[PDB]
């Protein structure tokens, strides 16, 4: 089954950007049957597809395959891919808390 995890990522400055050190796939505008990480291939949610060795997300405990449920209290289960990306990369936010589930 899935276990709930709560991680707290402190973004890393890389030049002008604040970065999280991971990648995402999914979103309501994408084909969920293409998601290799989900248990249920109708799941249109946002999944962690890669984590950078030594980066903020790794340090915080994020793992490849995690499903992102919320970012700073903001629901991520019914958003487009771009909407998810934007929520994760707000320039004004250095700290982001992710609610995730992990198989």
């Amino acid at each position: 089954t899935a276990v709930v995890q709560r991680v707290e990522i402190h973004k890393l400055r890389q030049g002008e950007n604040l970065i999280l050190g991971f990648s995402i796939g999914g979103g309501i505008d994408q084909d969920p049957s293409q998601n290799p990480f989900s248990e249920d291939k109708t799941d249109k949610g946002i999944y962690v597809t890669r984590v950078s060795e030594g980066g903020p997300a790794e340090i915080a405990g994020l793992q490849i395959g995690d499903k992102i449920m919320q970012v700073n209290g903001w629901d991520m289960t019914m958003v487009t891919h771009d909407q998810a990306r934007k929520r994760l990369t707000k320039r004004s936010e250095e700290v982001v808390r992710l609610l995730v589930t992990r198989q």
Partner: peptide
């Protein structure tokens, strides 16, 4: 990578 399933670096 999968052209039918984009990923984004953040």
């Amino acid at each position: 990578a999968n052209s039918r399933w984009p990923t984004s670096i953040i």
